[PDB]
Amino acid sequence: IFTVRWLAIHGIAVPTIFFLGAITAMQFIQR
Amino acid sequence: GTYQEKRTWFDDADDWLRQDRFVFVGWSGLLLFPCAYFALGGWLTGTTFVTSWYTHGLATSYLEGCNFLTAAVSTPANSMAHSLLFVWGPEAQGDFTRWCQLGGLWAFVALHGAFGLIGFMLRQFEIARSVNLRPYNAIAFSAPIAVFVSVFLIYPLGQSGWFFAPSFGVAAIFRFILFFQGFHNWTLNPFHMMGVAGVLGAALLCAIHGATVENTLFEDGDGANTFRAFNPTQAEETYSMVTANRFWSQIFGVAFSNKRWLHFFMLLVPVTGLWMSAIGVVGLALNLRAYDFVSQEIRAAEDPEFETFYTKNILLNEGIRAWMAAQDQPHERLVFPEEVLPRGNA
Amino acid sequence: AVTPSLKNFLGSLIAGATVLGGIALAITAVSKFD
Amino acid sequence: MEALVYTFLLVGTLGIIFFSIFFRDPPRMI
Amino acid sequence: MEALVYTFLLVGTLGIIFFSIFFRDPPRMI
Amino acid sequence: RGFDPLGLSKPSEFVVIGVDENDQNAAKNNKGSVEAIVQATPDEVSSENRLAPYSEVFGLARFRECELIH
Amino acid sequence: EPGLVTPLGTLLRPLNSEAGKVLPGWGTTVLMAVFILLFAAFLLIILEIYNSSLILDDVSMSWETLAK
Amino acid sequence: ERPFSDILTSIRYWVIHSITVPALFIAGWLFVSTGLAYDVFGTPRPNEYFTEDRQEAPLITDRFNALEQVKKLSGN
Amino acid sequence: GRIPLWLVGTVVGTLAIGLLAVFFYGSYVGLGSSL
Amino acid sequence: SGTFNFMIVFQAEHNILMHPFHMLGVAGVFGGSLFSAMHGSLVTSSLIRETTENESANE
Amino acid sequence: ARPNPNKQVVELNRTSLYWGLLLIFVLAVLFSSYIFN
Amino acid sequence: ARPNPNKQVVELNRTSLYWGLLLIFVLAVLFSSYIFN
Amino acid sequence: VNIYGLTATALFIIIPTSFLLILYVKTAST
Amino acid sequence: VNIYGLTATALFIIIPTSFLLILYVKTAST
Amino acid sequence: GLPWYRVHTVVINDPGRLISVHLMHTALVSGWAGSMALFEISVFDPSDPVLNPMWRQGMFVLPFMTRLGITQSWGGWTISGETATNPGIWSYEGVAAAHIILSGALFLASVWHWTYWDLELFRDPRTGKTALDLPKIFGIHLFLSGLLCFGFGAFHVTGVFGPGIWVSDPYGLTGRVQPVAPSWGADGFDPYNPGGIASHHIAAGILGVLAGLFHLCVRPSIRLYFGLSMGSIETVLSSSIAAVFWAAFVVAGTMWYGSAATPIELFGPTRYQWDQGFFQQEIQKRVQASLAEGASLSDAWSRIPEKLAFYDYIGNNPAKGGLFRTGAMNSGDGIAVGWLGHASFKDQEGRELFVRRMPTFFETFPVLLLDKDGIVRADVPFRKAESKYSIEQVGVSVTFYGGELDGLTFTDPATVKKYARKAQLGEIFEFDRSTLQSDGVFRSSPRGWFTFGHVCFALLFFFGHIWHGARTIFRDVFAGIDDDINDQVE
Ligand code: CLA
Ligand code: CLA
Ligand code: CLA
Ligand code: CLA
Ligand SMILES: C=Cc1c(C)c2cc3nc(c4c5[nH]c(cc6nc(cc1[nH]2)C(C)=C6CC)c(C)c5C(=O)[C@@H]4C(=O)OC)[C@@H](CCC(=O)OC/C=C(\C)CCC[C@H](C)CCC[C@H](C)CCCC(C)C)[C@@H]3C
Ligand SMILES: CCCCCCCCCCCCCCCC(=O)OC[C@H](CO[C@@H]1O[C@H](CS(=O)(=O)O)[C@@H](O)[C@H](O)[C@H]1O)OC(=O)CCCCCCCCCCCCCCC
Ligand SMILES: CCCCCCCCCCCCCCCC(=O)OC[C@H](CO[C@@H]1O[C@H](CS(=O)(=O)O)[C@@H](O)[C@H](O)[C@H]1O)OC(=O)CCCCCCCCCCCCCCC
Ligand SMILES: CC1=C(/C=C/C(C)=C/C=C/C(C)=C/C=C/C=C(C)/C=C/C=C(C)/C=C/C2=C(C)CCCC2(C)C)C(C)(C)CCC1
Ligand SMILES: CC1=C(/C=C/C(C)=C/C=C/C(C)=C/C=C/C=C(C)/C=C/C=C(C)/C=C/C2=C(C)CCCC2(C)C)C(C)(C)CCC1
Ligand SMILES: [Fe+2]
């Protein structure tokens, strides 16, 4: 499936779940 | 048309582009969608991982402990001051991880945001011509473009650097606002005093017209949930323009009588406000600011008994300039003894 | 003569032609797919 | 001198506000 | 300063004299 | 000698579009639309014009004269 | 009704005469797009020169350059 | 097809977005926890802000010569 | 459809408000914790 | 100018810009002006043709 | 209340506009020499 | 020569007179503070 | 210069000028 | 006082005031 | 009937009145320039060009005459330091009277085309109604546009027939109108090269002629006709408003950043020559040029010109201005009378101290005395109660080198502060604040005022491009949309 509507979601939904992996691991970084 | 000309490849491409869909692409989508996507995606990348420790000398990322309020895609340093900071250009020379460190990811967002805002305004033209409407939605969106272009582009291209632009962050705006009070006395520029009246005046027309309509409705249903009683294809209107006239005519004194003029008046008040505030930033870009009244600085010079709140504001602008500019402008390399800065007592 | 600045500048225009050209060949693929 | 020029323009604005209420163009229905 | 205020009012009078000849109200008979 | 690439002396027929509506006291000022597909008529050199004698810029008889005077 | 006819009006009459005639098809439009894309590249020369974003060997772009 | 109600109810949706979704999340965890994010973008680690040469905030003050200068201020 | 929508939004809406509590928890501990 | 001193002294003592209630009110008027510029544009842009072009659209 | 039946109209034709504007400018040429002294 | 068929008329009703005169006086209240400095 | 010199002239010109224009424009629109 | 202060204000008031009066008086005489 | 803001659209139908209006607007724009010139040459002061120059006097249209080669008045004075041998017919007064007789000429031509608006030139054949061949009429103006552009470069700048343009030295110390030769290499795009100006108008002059003969001969496409709406008189209006603010951002930028088309000795220095230290890297440069041969300090500072110490002064920076501070820069802080010599601040042990200069941002910067190396040594503090770095506990004395105080000393606790406060502003001067009744606060040079007007105008014309751009495309539904448009429901 390669739809204009699908790309619009997965152009945003794919990098935002990659970034929520980052910031949640940023919370457990000690000084 | 009406003489049977043939179809070329460009004509075939147009039908796919102006095909109705869940999201409208059009021709302006080629300018909008790859320029808007990289703008906010370049904002979320910079606020999360990319530092500002080499440009300003202060941490700005979630990877450094800054929260949602204190993260910012910071402006470049005042060394460059007007370069476009291309990733291939001489200040970067191809290396990406050194390109972000010089603050060049600011110019990636500001320049790809400007061609987004051209493209989004072009989006409102070809949709309106497709549905055959009038272009007034496009004409209103010029006022957010005039604020964007003057503040983020014309103002650094008049001052000494891209350094003095706003940074794309929450608290970074909050110093840019506080920059303009001490260093410019921006609250006494009447072009901002007409900007406020546009903003607060349009907030008032959003609250009255939304409440006058809602309280003069016509009883058309029988359930008290009055949102259920609106078939949107109905020929009659849903509220009473006669009754709404007589309410504000006796409450306030003068009221509307023309539903066409009313919604156009709600168009004119916010658009004039921002357009009359884009002019004031142009004067600040040349430092043609309305800082002083001459005939009261003279009178306060010769007499220690006369003052106003105006002369009390000039001292507070001195308190912003002589204090924060040690860290705010680190390229000026200046240090201060604790006796040269003005204070009161204790 | 040629500098590192102009070598990178003429690298940018051919970078610009691949993007605008690649998009122009992207629609003409899709629009002929109907 | 300007202290009386200011008060002309203040009460001048309050002049129109008197005339815009009581001597307004009366709206006629239909 | 007044030397240019005088010359405004001189050529101002000569303005009307131009407009009073060529752009006059044309006298229609009967 | 048969030397004409780029079709510079091809008979180049035209098409003429009517004028549009200014008509400020009206409801809709539409557009101009197509009227007729005329053919090109070169080398009428009628001398009431005196600043543009030929009926066509792209006529073979004018370029012959323009080659010679050059 | 007729207009007014002047000596200079009849002279400039064939200039304002053929109002409406167009070429069918696309015409020289593809040739026009060549000159735009060159002229857009021409502005990126003189901008990135004047921004000092591309450095040439004979310009130096200061007030000293103006004095030989 | 797909009026957006049947998408969020079908079981073929939740057999795809129960596997690619954590695999995209865990890969987002590793990008920072392995120290990769500090070097692909260039933000300094908390034990890396001040080196032995400088003991204050960095400062460039040269336009065309910034690329080699920042590499000195980075401690590298 | 198969799964009822109402316990889809409950599970996601819990795991969103469960996710927000970590960022408030990470505000007092770790980096930026002012200690 | 009396108001402008009150805005300055307040934020010096209380830091109003870093308070979420001032953040809501700022969004209350930037949203409020947007919702008036956008609503008032579309009603003007969908008016039915009833007048001429020399006459104003309010007639 | 009742409409007033004394409503009259005032008019000023073009040949009277020219006597008006030429009156005002000419004595403004006259007296302005004295106002500035 | 011929009478021009583009002759149009201009009008300004009373509710527009009041927006005009209130516009002018208000920003004259605004800017006159700055002209005298 | 008389400071009130050029502004007593300016009000003497513009106010009866604007008086006669109002009466003429309503006349010629008949 | 700015000598041109009160007379740039006075021309700013009276000239657009007299502009709107001319258009209104010809309107109300219809 | 019309509203008040559609009153000028009676002209949009017939062609003939549109000339008559465009002549009337042309008569005003010239008649401004004739009036602005005569007003200003009657208030010009040609006395002291080295120190009360043309730009500081606060002046708008007279540098735009000087730049193309008008340096003599009918009064008999010049700019550069001499008097008039003979002014000739084209002088300051004559050019001023050239536009006004032009303005009275174009006034009369408007009156003719207003009355005889109906001409057979305009009613086209095969319809018999008012039309304009809008592409072909563009070729006639575009031909004559580049023809004047070619003639200006080949003759008026090159000096074959005209006089040339203004050309200065790098530091504004000299320069006048000589002919220049065009430069054709990459130096022709150096904006500080004057040879690029003559090269531009010859090159762009030819191409406009070749484009002028193109658009006369080649009719536009039918596909490009309906796209850009060629058959309407307003699609050129929305684009001509579009073209002219592209012009006005370029014109404002080259004024503000400086160019060869804006010499600094006509308009005053930029703000970018202060903060970059353009003059301080020349004054200190020429001191070391004369100390290397061996001389006293008062020898070398006696050899530095008085003019170059005048350009290095923050009261000449246009960014140190105010929006509602009207008038001349000389109305700000007096006519400059003389230079007062370079102050030098010696310690009690004779160590020379350095004044931290004031950046063009803060209205007031507090004074400091940095050492040779850049460390604060003395200052005028705020809190006199607790104070250890104050100057009376340091003992800073001032010595002047040339100017008016040549080889003097002061150790006075009032006089040292009175000149160290003046030392922030660049160089020290004497003025006369009684000649113009100066207020004491600065203003902005005409470089600063021209930049303000031609950005506010340009950014306003951006709205004009949208509105007339949106009026041409949406012309059919200007009066409100039709009845049934409910076809668009999915
Ligand atoms: C159409 C959408 C669009 C637009 C308008 C822009 C616009 C811009 N981008 Mg973005 N960008 C886009 C898409 C877009 N980009 C995409 C899809 C990507 C992902 C690959 C990027 C990635 C990107 C990066 C990483 C950067 C930019 C940058 C820039 C800026 C520099 C422009 C430049 O130098 O191009 C120059 C090229 C052209 C204008 C093309 C002109 C066409 C030429 C003239 C045709 C002739 C070609 C011919 C064959 C050449 C012959 C040469 C021969 C002699 C060898 C500009 C604001 C830079 C930036 O933001 O500055 C900080 C930057 O660093 N962009
Ligand atoms: C080359 C410039 C140019 C030209 C020829 C036109 C021509 C036209 N415009 Mg456009 N317009 C322009 C620029 C231009 N405009 C710009 C820059 C803007 C943005 C501000 C607009 C915004 C605009 C709107 C919003 C409208 C027009 C309208 C019109 C039409 C009638 C104008 C009218 O009745 O005004 C009458 C003007 C007056 C009665 C006096 C106005 C007083 C002004 C505001 C201040 C005084 C003038 C000032 C002192 C002079 C200084 C000039 C400055 C350049 C230095 C006409 C087709 C109208 C239209 O198309 O409707 C059919 C219309 O509604 N224009
Ligand atoms: C022998 C060949 C030759 C030579 C030596 C020159 C020499 C020159 N030309 Mg010319 N030219 C030539 C041939 C030549 N020309 C030909 C054949 C053409 C085609 C007709 C042109 C067309 C042309 C144009 C159109 C321009 C020049 C300019 C210049 C100057 C160089 C650039 C400059 O000064 O930077 C300064 C100018 C710039 C850096 C241009 C900046 C453009 C920016 C992008 C516009 C910004 C507006 C935009 C809307 C942004 C606003 C919003 C923003 C604030 C946020 C110089 C005098 C420029 C000029 O006028 O010089 C002042 C210019 O604009 N030339
Ligand atoms: C008879 C010819 C003539 C001559 C020789 C002059 C000479 C002069 N005038 Mg006058 N003037 C004239 C006619 C003339 N004027 C007319 C007819 C008008 C009425 C509009 C004026 C209005 C006028 C004003 C308002 C002013 C002058 C000024 C000046 C002086 C400097 C001009 C200057 O630097 O402009 C420089 C000109 C430009 C920078 C314009 C460049 C062209 C732009 C970029 C438009 C290009 C668009 C075009 C389509 C190009 C495309 C073609 C190309 C692709 C080939 C100079 C003494 C100025 C002065 O000093 O005051 C006295 C001034 O302020 N004049
Ligand atoms: C801060 C206030 C503010 C915001 C956030 C805002 C936002 C928006 N307004 C829009 C529209 C409008 N707003 C209008 C009038 C107004 N808008 C105003 C104020 C605002 N308007 C005001 C005051 C007015 C009155 C004149 C109109 C008339 C419209 C519309 O019609 C339009 C719409 O349809 O809304 C639905 C939308 C633009 C869509 C778009 O371009 O996305 C595409 C994204 C692009 C092009 C990228 C922009 C990139 C920006 C410029 C720079 C990057 C910034 C980062 C991404 C974020 C930085 C955040 C930090 C500051 C914290 C969006 C919802
Ligand atoms: C606190 C106060 C401080 C001082 C106040 C100073 C005010 C200065 C600004 C005044 C603004 C005036 C704007 C125009 C008003 C207007 O159009 O009214 C229109 C009304 C129409 O009413 C019509 O009257 C008609 C009845 S009849 O025909 O007139 O008999 C009726 O048919 C119709 O329905 C009705 O609309 O005209 C009148 O009936 C009254 C005459 C108004 C004209 C005089 C106003 C100027 C004098 C003001 C007082 C002296 C001030 C000194 C300076 C002038
Ligand atoms: C040496 C000069 C020195 C400078 C001059 C400065 C002059 C200043 C004073 C001007 C006096 C004007 C008084 C009123 C004139 C009048 O009523 O004309 C009435 C005529 C009627 O003519 C009519 O024209 C009609 C044709 S048509 O309908 O107009 O097409 C026709 O039907 C009818 O018979 C005919 O009468 O109106 C016109 O046709 C022309 C418009 C006149 C209005 C503009 C005048 C102001 C601009 C002057 C120039 C700029 C000056 C700057 C200051 C304003
Ligand atoms: C720069 C760059 C680029 C780009 C990139 C991109 C484009 C990216 C993207 C990115 C993205 C696209 C991202 C996104 C993100 C997102 C996020 C990060 C989010 C977050 C959020 C949060 C955190 C929150 C949430 C929430 C809310 C909203 C509220 C409620 C609750 C919740 C939780 C739900 C390019 C390639 C051009 C080039 C190279 C480099
Ligand atoms: C008829 C005749 C004649 C005469 C002529 C004349 C006498 C002329 C004059 C002319 C003139 C004498 C003109 C003038 C003009 C002026 C002007 C035109 C001005 C303008 C201005 C403006 C427009 C302004 C605006 C503004 C304002 C308001 C403020 C500031 C800013 C601005 C800009 C906004 C003769 C004998 C020769 C011969 C023939 C016949
Ligand atoms: Fe509504």
mmCIF file of C-alpha atoms in Angstrom, chain H residues 1 3 10-11 15 20-21 26 30 34 43 45 47 52 56 65 74-75:
data_model
loop_
_atom_site.group_PDB
_atom_site.id
_atom_site.type_symbol
_atom_site.label_atom_id
_atom_site.label_comp_id
_atom_site.label_asym_id
_atom_site.label_seq_id
_atom_site.Cartn_x
_atom_site.Cartn_y
_atom_site.Cartn_z
ATOM 1 C CA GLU H 1 -12.277 1.210 1.122
ATOM 2 C CA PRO H 3 -13.328 4.509 6.175
ATOM 3 C CA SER H 10 -9.315 -5.222 12.262
ATOM 4 C CA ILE H 11 -6.964 -7.848 13.629
ATOM 5 C CA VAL H 15 -0.749 -8.061 13.937
ATOM 6 C CA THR H 20 7.045 -2.932 14.049
ATOM 7 C CA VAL H 21 5.941 -0.542 16.816
ATOM 8 C CA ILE H 26 13.610 -0.161 21.141
ATOM 9 C CA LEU H 30 19.479 2.214 21.657
ATOM 10 C CA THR H 34 24.820 3.407 23.420
ATOM 11 C CA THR H 43 26.409 17.455 21.674
ATOM 12 C CA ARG H 45 28.492 14.460 27.259
ATOM 13 C CA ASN H 47 31.894 14.780 31.463
ATOM 14 C CA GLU H 52 41.778 21.272 30.355
ATOM 15 C CA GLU H 56 34.563 28.779 30.227
ATOM 16 C CA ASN H 65 37.925 29.694 9.999
ATOM 17 C CA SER H 74 35.672 20.373 21.250
ATOM 18 C CA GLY H 75 38.817 18.999 22.887
#
